[PDB]
Design a protein around this motif. Structure first.
Motif, PDB file in Angstrom:
ATOM      1  N   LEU A  95      49.359   7.557  16.196  1.00  0.00           N
ATOM      2  CA  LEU A  95      48.620   6.744  15.252  1.00  0.00           C
ATOM      3  C   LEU A  95      49.378   5.446  15.009  1.00  0.00           C
ATOM      4  O   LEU A  95      50.550   5.466  14.644  1.00  0.00           O
ATOM      5  N   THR A  96      48.712   4.315  15.210  1.00  0.00           N
ATOM      6  CA  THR A  96      49.326   3.018  14.918  1.00  0.00           C
ATOM      7  C   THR A  96      49.454   2.783  13.416  1.00  0.00           C
ATOM      8  O   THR A  96      48.453   2.853  12.693  1.00  0.00           O
ATOM      9  N   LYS A 124      47.133   0.999  10.676  1.00  0.00           N
ATOM     10  CA  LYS A 124      45.845   0.803  11.348  1.00  0.00           C
ATOM     11  C   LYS A 124      45.008   2.060  11.560  1.00  0.00           C
ATOM     12  O   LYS A 124      43.834   2.094  11.197  1.00  0.00           O
ATOM     13  N   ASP A 125      45.584   3.065  12.214  1.00  0.00           N
ATOM     14  CA  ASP A 125      44.806   4.216  12.634  1.00  0.00           C
ATOM     15  C   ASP A 125      44.650   5.258  11.513  1.00  0.00           C
ATOM     16  O   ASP A 125      45.370   5.229  10.518  1.00  0.00           O
ATOM     17  N   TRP A 126      43.704   6.173  11.714  1.00  0.00           N
ATOM     18  CA  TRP A 126      43.336   7.185  10.738  1.00  0.00           C
ATOM     19  C   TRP A 126      43.426   8.581  11.320  1.00  0.00           C
ATOM     20  O   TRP A 126      43.111   8.803  12.496  1.00  0.00           O
ATOM     21  N   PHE A 146      50.267   6.141   8.126  1.00  0.00           N
ATOM     22  CA  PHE A 146      48.997   6.546   8.713  1.00  0.00           C
ATOM     23  C   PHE A 146      47.960   6.538   7.595  1.00  0.00           C
ATOM     24  O   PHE A 146      48.211   7.083   6.513  1.00  0.00           O
ATOM     25  N   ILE A 159      37.440   2.263   8.409  1.00  0.00           N
ATOM     26  CA  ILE A 159      38.225   2.221   9.627  1.00  0.00           C
ATOM     27  C   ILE A 159      38.216   0.809  10.239  1.00  0.00           C
ATOM     28  O   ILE A 159      39.266   0.299  10.629  1.00  0.00           O
ATOM     29  N   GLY A 210      41.827  -0.237  12.852  1.00  0.00           N
ATOM     30  CA  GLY A 210      42.299   0.881  13.649  1.00  0.00           C
ATOM     31  C   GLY A 210      41.173   1.777  14.110  1.00  0.00           C
ATOM     32  O   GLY A 210      40.019   1.358  14.171  1.00  0.00           O
ATOM     33  N   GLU A 211      41.513   3.011  14.460  1.00  0.00           N
ATOM     34  CA  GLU A 211      40.513   3.997  14.850  1.00  0.00           C
ATOM     35  C   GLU A 211      40.862   5.333  14.231  1.00  0.00           C
ATOM     36  O   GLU A 211      42.019   5.606  13.956  1.00  0.00           O
ATOM     37  N   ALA A 212      39.854   6.160  14.007  1.00  0.00           N
ATOM     38  CA  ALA A 212      40.107   7.535  13.630  1.00  0.00           C
ATOM     39  C   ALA A 212      40.329   8.324  14.920  1.00  0.00           C
ATOM     40  O   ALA A 212      39.405   8.508  15.709  1.00  0.00           O
ATOM     41  N   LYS A 213      41.564   8.781  15.125  1.00  0.00           N
ATOM     42  CA  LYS A 213      41.977   9.368  16.389  1.00  0.00           C
ATOM     43  C   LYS A 213      42.205  10.851  16.335  1.00  0.00           C
ATOM     44  O   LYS A 213      42.266  11.521  17.375  1.00  0.00           O
ATOM     45  N   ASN A 226      36.578   8.208  16.177  1.00  0.00           N
ATOM     46  CA  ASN A 226      36.163   7.260  17.205  1.00  0.00           C
ATOM     47  C   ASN A 226      36.118   7.970  18.552  1.00  0.00           C
ATOM     48  O   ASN A 226      36.443   9.165  18.640  1.00  0.00           O
TER      49      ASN A 226
END
Lengths: 364, 364
Positions: free
Chosen positions: B164-165, B168-170, B193, B239, B244-247, B266
């Motif tokens: 997870l960045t 940014k990311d979720w 995160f 998001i 970011g993105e939900a990963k 995502n």
């Protein structure tokens, strides 16, 4: 000047509602050096084509005015077989008479003709070329027109994800009599993989079972048997006796069927879902994830191959060769010939509607 | 000569029915060179512990006579905090007064004392050692007694599978108020995160939401919101604004809840299932697999670390440090102190029965 027909839509929706046919012209005396004109031989109706028209597929052709329409329109069909009619002055890779398929998705194959660049196409051997190369078979039109989705799907699912030990390991699949299911049985046989095909019960069960075993299924059971643990012990004995493990599940049904084949895997099992039968989610017992280290993933061939030309090429080349060598057989399509008495889009609308009867191939 | 009590069972079943306490003796004047004797400071009642007693679990301690029982019986508990009271002649890794947890499962932590090898244990700093070395805090007994499973589970699920960045990311998780949920919220905050916590609705929702956000959840939503088609855009907007993105989804509920958090990922999302409520299978729409390249996998910390000491050590050290720096907090256990006036197993039985009141810790 060639007058051609294309099946288009200006808005997403059900094929029965949004499709229409558009006449357009191709100037065959005005070819850029790398341009190619092709005439369609056949193109099938696939579930992904329909999903594109519905607007739910990940990839879809852009709506454009390229067909001379009033509003931006998208073409239909991702795969099909074409014959090269004429090539530009700098085209060496193709010549008139050659067989080709699209090199990429979103080409729009539900139409009579197309103008493209030479790298818009992948050459297949036509039967005269196969014969001259000493091969015992040439491709049929159905085999060429349906070569890019279902056979590659079966091949890649069996080889690209988990390594089955030849002569030992197993994959299990539901939708055993589907087009991909029958390819996977045949490819499993060629690769010396054991397999269980789970199928729906039928009046002629004994015949279907013998037929699938001939194709290369090691064992064939019904969904009822997949879900009966009165029948259960039979299956672990099969795997036991082989000295291998059930490592891979191919799911195209979902629901109770997907649970059933998932439970048959050994530890560290992988399930690939590549299709789904209506409103049925993939349903996996929590215990498989936590205790058996089960993984459930998706497969979609067009996304997988989008930026992997080397993988596409080697896979496609192997399927072509297997057809030439008599090692692979296609399921017969229901063929509807376009003779121009009925609007082209209606042939394809019928094909969508009749896909329950079997694979629909519109031929030209 | 030490008089010890162990909680044991001769037959699998409900802890209600099958548990009893036995006395056994530990001779402290004769330790083999690598042997160690520990007294229990605290050990919790965990789901898996109950499962082993029922027998439904995978890995269990072997039934022996070592506790001087009239019949073969097994010990209970896999998690616990112990204090070294005496070591053998060849033991350098541990000294009297050291805090330790089992280095493996099936230890049997529902007892007052244990005899093992020095390699059966992993050292934790006791509060005296933390304090003497200038750490702002030392571990509490509950923190030490519950450190091996839930904090490691949260940390590893968040860091070991997808990157997870930061900022940014979720990730999104259900069971947001579970012990693992609360650790994951804190670790998410610590590592920058973003997270969505999905929780069951409750009479004191506002209080719970505020509490989870303080722990580190970026957003907290109810299962009703999770189920809402119409809420989709809000979550996408969260998001998008983070860039970011939900990963990553963490699932410990199954059913509709697993579906809801899966849909919020995502493309190329990963779900890890680490727990499950009752019946409920993990239910994933076929389209997530096929159109969004969704993956659903399992997590079980025992198997993951079974032969990865380096990972276990590295992870444990981070949790220890955070507890010492005051950056991580445990949920309070209902503590029941064994003093000998009530049979030890009855305290654990009460623990199992009162499990819905909170994490139950039996202290010594």
């Amino acid at each position: 000047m060639i007058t051609a027909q294309a099946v288009l839509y200006t808005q997403h929706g059900e094929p029965k509602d949004v499709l229409f046919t558009q006449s357009f012209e191709i100037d065959d005396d005005n070819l850029a050096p790398n341009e190619v004109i092709v005439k369609t031989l056949g193109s099938p109706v696939n579930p992904s084509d329909i999903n594109q028209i519905q607007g739910v597929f990940p990839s879809k052709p852009a709506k454009t005015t390229g067909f001379g329409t009033t509003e931006p329109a998208a073409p239909c069909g991702n795969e099909g077989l074409f014959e090269v009619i004429k090539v530009g002055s700098n085209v060496s890779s193709l010549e008139a008479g050659d067989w080709v398929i699209p090199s990429h998705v979103n080409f729009g194959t539900w139409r009579t003709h197309a103008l493209g660049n030479d790298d818009d196409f992948i050459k297949l051997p036509n039967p005269a070329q196969s014969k001259a190369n000493g091969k015992p078979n040439g491709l049929t039109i159905n085999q060429g027109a349906t070569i890019s989705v279902n056979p590659l799907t079966a091949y890649l699912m069996l080889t690209h994800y988990v390594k089955l030990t030849p002569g030992k390991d197993w994959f299990i699949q539901n939708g055993g009599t589907s087009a991909v299911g029958k390819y996977a049985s045949q490819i499993g046989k060629l690769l010396n993989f054991n397999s269980i095909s789970v199928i729906r019960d039928r009046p002629n069960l004994d015949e279907v079972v013998a037929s699938l075993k001939e194709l290369g299924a090691t064992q064939v059971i019904t969904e009822d048997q997949n879900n009966s643990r009165e029948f259960g012990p039979t299956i672990k004995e099969w795997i036991k006796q082989s000295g291998g493990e059930a490592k891979l599940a191919l799911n195209c049904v979902g629901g109770k069927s997907s649970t059933g084949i998932a439970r048959k895997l050994n530890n560290n099992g992988l399930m690939l879902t590549y299709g789904g039968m209506s409103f049925q989610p993939v349903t996996i017992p929590t215990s498989l994830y936590i205790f058996k280290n089960f993984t459930s993933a998706g497969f979609e061939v067009t996304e997988l191959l989008k930026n992997n030309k080397e993988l596409k090429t080697s896979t496609l080349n192997q399927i072509i060769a297997w057809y030439e060598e008599g090692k692979l057989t296609d399921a017969k399509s229901i063929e509807t010939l376009y003779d121009g008495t009925k609007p082209l889009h209606e042939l394809y609308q019928d094909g969508v509607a009749n896909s329950k009867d079997g694979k629909q191939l519109i031929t030209y």
